[PDB]
CSV table of C-alpha atoms (C1' of nucleotides) in Angstrom, one decimal:
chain,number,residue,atom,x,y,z
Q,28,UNK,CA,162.0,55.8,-5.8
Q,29,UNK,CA,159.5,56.8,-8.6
Q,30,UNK,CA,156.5,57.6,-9.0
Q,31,UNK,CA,153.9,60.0,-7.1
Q,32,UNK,CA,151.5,59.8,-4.1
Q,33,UNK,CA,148.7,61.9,-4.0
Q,34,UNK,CA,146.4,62.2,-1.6
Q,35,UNK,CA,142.8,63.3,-2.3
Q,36,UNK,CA,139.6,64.3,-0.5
Q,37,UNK,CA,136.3,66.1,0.2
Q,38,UNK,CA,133.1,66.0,1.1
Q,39,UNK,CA,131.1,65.9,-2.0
Q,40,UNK,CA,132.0,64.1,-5.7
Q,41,UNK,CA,130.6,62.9,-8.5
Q,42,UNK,CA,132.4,60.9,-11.6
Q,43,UNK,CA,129.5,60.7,-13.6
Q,44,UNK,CA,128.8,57.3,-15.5
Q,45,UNK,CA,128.4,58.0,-19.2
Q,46,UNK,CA,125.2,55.8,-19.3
Q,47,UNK,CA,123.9,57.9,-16.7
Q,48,UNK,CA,124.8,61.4,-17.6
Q,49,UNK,CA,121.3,62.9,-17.5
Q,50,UNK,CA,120.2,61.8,-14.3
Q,51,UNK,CA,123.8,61.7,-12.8
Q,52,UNK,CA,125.0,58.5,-11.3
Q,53,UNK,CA,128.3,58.5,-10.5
Q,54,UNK,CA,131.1,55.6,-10.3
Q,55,UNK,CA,131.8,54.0,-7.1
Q,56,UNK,CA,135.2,55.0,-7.2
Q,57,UNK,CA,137.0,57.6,-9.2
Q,58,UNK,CA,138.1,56.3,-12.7
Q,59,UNK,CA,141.7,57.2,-13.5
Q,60,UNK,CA,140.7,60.1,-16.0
Q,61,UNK,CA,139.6,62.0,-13.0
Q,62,UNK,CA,142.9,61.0,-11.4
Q,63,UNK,CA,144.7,62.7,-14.6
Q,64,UNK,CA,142.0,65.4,-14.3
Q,65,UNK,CA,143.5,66.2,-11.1
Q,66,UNK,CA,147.1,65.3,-11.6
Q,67,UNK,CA,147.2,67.8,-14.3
Q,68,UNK,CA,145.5,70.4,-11.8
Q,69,UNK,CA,148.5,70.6,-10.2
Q,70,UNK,CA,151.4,70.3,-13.3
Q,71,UNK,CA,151.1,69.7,-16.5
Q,72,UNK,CA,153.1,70.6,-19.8
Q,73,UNK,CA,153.0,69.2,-23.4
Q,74,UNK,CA,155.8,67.5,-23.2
Q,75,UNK,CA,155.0,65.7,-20.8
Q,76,UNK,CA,152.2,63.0,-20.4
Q,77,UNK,CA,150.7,61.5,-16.9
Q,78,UNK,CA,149.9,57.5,-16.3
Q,79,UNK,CA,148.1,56.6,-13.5
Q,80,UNK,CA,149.3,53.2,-11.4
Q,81,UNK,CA,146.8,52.9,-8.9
Q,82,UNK,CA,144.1,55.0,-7.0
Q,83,UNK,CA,143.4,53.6,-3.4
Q,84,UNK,CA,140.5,54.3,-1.4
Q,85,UNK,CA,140.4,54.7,2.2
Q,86,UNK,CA,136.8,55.7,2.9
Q,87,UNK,CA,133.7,53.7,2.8
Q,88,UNK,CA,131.5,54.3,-0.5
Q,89,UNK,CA,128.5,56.5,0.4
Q,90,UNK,CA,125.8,57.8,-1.9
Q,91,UNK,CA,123.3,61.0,-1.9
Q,92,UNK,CA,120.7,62.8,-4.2
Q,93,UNK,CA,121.0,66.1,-5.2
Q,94,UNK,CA,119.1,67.8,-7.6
Q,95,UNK,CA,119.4,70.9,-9.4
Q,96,UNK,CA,117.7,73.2,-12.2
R,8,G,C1',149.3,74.3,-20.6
R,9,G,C1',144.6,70.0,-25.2
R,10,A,C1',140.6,67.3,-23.0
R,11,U,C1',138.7,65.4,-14.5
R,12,U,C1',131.2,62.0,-20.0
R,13,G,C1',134.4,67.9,-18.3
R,14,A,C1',133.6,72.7,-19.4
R,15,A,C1',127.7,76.7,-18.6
R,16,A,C1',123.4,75.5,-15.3
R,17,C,C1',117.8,79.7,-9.5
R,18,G,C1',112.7,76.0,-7.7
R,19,C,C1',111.2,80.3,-9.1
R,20,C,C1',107.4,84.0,-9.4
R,21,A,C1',102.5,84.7,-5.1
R,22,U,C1',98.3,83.6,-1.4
R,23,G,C1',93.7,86.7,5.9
R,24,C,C1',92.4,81.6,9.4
R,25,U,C1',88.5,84.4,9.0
R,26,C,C1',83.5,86.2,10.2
R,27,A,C1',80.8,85.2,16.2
R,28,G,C1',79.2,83.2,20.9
R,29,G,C1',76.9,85.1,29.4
R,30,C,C1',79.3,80.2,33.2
R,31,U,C1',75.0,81.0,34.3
R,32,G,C1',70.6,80.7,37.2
R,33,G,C1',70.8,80.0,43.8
R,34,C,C1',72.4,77.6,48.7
R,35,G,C1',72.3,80.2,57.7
R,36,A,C1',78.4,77.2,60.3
R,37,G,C1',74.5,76.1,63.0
R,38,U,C1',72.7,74.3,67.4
R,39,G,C1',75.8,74.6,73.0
R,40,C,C1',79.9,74.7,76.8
R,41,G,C1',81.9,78.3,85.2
R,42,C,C1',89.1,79.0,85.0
R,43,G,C1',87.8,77.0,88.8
R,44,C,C1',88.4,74.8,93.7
R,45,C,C1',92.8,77.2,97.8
R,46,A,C1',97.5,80.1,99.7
R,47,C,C1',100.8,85.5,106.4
R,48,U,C1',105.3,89.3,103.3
R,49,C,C1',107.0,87.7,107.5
R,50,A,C1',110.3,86.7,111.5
R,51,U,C1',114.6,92.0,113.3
R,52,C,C1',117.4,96.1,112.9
R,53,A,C1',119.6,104.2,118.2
R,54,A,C1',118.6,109.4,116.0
R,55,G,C1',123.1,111.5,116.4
RNA sequence: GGAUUGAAACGCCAUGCUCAGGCUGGCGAGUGCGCGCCACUCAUCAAG
């Protein structure tokens, strides 16, 4: 009808939490400016602006540590 | 084609397990013990 349905995944991510930027600690779940991030991946023009409905998440919320110089 | 608290981001440089120290000194398989007691090769069959 209208709309999109996008389905995304991988092994590793990280939507960092701005009161944890530092010493990353990301969001449960992705917030929807990593879903425009994305959308806009894909297509995106001027004239034209994205608006995110929904994000749904299928996979059980697991955390890790990584750390880098 | 403006922005995914994003875009850029080595754990990295290097460091003998080494120097050495008999498994040795010595200890009969040994003392002894019938294979032995008996038993027909034998009853026959020209040489051509």
């Amino acid at each position: 009808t209208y709309g999109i349905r996008l389905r995304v995944w991988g092994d590793y991510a990280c939507f960092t939490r701005p009161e944890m930027k530092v010493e990353r600690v990301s969001y449960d779940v992705m917030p929807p400016s990593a879903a425009r991030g994305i959308l806009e991946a894909i297509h995106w023009k001027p004239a034209i602006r994205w608006i995110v409905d929904r994000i749904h998440v299928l996979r059980p919320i697991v955390f890790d540590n990584v750390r880098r110089n």
